[PDB]
Amino acid sequence: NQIRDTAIYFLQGKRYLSLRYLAYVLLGMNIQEGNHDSIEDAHTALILYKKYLHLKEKAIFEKVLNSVYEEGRAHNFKVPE
RNA sequence: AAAAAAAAAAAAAAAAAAAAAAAAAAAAAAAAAAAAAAAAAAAAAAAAAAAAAAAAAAAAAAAAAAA
Ligand SMILES: [Mg+2]
């Protein structure tokens, strides 16, 4: 009940996701720059966990999630630059 | 008066019993009767009778990270 892993709430196909593209899609793509700020990492993970909380209160996040999953696999889940 | 040594080396010696035609009995139904080395000489291991062997146990992984 305490591991609370935002990679696991949005996991797909045993592909342990790289949260750079997750923050580029689900929020502003400010986590696509660089410099590897850990405080930025935890803060964006906080924001994505809040996004999980909001759209799990909406409880329909798998629909648009799988739509943008297929859409980003047309992108092949790469880094948009 | 058939009157013989009275036992080495743990010697050595007894049996502890039969066709019965006694009386007017034919010619193997036995179940098989069945010997040869020795010129430096004969030589299975696995565990040993298939009187009934269906014999691919699904797979799919689009991929990571971890800024
Ligand atoms: Mg990652």
Swiss-Prot record:
Please list which residues make up the signal peptide: none
SUBUNIT field: Forms a heterotrimer with an asymmetric homodimer of the regulatory subunit PAN3 to form the poly(A)-nuclease (PAN) deadenylation complex.
Q: Which residues of the full protein are shown?
A: 1031 to 1111 of 1115
Functional summary from the UniProt entry? Catalytic subunit of the poly(A)-nuclease (PAN) deadenylation complex, one of two cytoplasmic mRNA deadenylases involved in mRNA turnover. PAN specifically shortens poly(A) tails of RNA and the activity is stimulated by poly(A)-binding protein PAB1. PAN deadenylation is followed by rapid degradation of the shortened mRNA tails by the CCR4-NOT complex. Deadenylated mRNAs are then degraded by two alternative mechanisms, namely exosome-mediated 3'-5' exonucleolytic degradation, or deadenylation-dependent mRNA decaping by DCP1-DCP2 and subsequent 5'-3' exonucleolytic degradation by XRN1.
What is the protein name for this chain?
PAN2-PAN3 deadenylation complex catalytic subunit PAN2
Q: Miscellaneous notes for this chain?
A: Present with 1510 molecules/cell in log phase SD medium.
Detail which positions bind a divalent metal cation.
D41
Domain comment (free text): Contains a pseudo-UCH domain. This ubiquitin C-terminal hydrolase (UCH)-like or ubiquitin specific protease (USP)-like domain is predicted to be catalytically inactive because it lacks the active site catalytic triad characteristic of thiol proteases, with residues at the equivalent structural positions that are incompatible with catalysis, and it cannot bind ubiquitin. It functions as a structural scaffold for intra- and intermolecular interactions in the complex. The linker, or PAN3 interaction domain (PID), between the WD40 repeats and the pseudo-UCH domain mediates interaction with PAN3.
Recorded source organism is: Saccharomyces cerevisiae (strain ATCC 204508 / S288c)
**Compartments, record wording:** Cytoplasm
* Annotated family: Belongs to the peptidase C19 family. PAN2 subfamily.
